[PDB]
């Protein structure tokens, strides 16, 4: 809630996308609880 800075974001469809399917980017959809601010979760366990 006390973040200070610029959240820079731009479109990168011409770089991080491929017609055959660019599946190298993943995202965590299920989790036991809510994530704390500035926290990383790389575990591949099955929820």
């Amino acid at each position, epitope marked *: 809630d006390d973040f200070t800075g610029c959240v820079i974001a731009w479109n990168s469809n*011409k*770089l*991080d*996308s*491929k*017609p*055959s399917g660019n599946y190298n980017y993943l995202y965590r959809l299920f989790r036991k609880s809510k994530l704390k601010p500035f926290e990383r979760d790389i575990s591949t366990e099955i929820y």
Partner: antibody
Amino acid sequence: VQSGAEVKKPGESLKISCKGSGYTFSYYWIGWVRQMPGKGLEWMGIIYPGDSDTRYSPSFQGQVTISADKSISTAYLHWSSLKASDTAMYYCARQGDLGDWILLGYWGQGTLVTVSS
Amino acid sequence: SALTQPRSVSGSLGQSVTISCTGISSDVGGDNYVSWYQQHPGKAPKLMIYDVSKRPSGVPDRFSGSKSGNTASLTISGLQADDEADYYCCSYALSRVVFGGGTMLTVLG
């Protein structure tokens, strides 16, 4: 198959070409890499089939421009005020679904431009 | 930075050869931005080794690579007569394509 290399003098604005096949010229990056006799490959820049967001090498910002044709899927290059050290084997490469956008999946045939007087 | 490669190597039929590749940079996002290209003398170059953590399609299994800090190596086994070609390592971590100093693969017999 590529066009022949005619003997030209520095300052005549010659042109080279390359013909590729086996893909769709819609969203795959494509560029040109030269090779001078006695040295390795030298990457100049690439071009996008849509918005031509061309990113040239720092040593090729104002030395060569990309003028590839999209309607015929044939790449082309344009020069202006050439020099004697411009003789190199230009190879046409594309993005390909093998690696990332900058990775070169396939390559062309290559034509060695000869400059003499 | 400029990639440093041996000018000429001396292999042998049936043996192995390791081509060195130094000067590889890295950016935020990964450090496996290493790719090798196979260019026959007077012929068209062909992509041989890229993403050494994986295996390309159509390339024989006798080609592999490794990573150790800023120095990479190309492990090639089963040297034959038709394997005589030029090899160059590439680094594209900073969205810039760079090549080595040129390598000439020679075999004995």
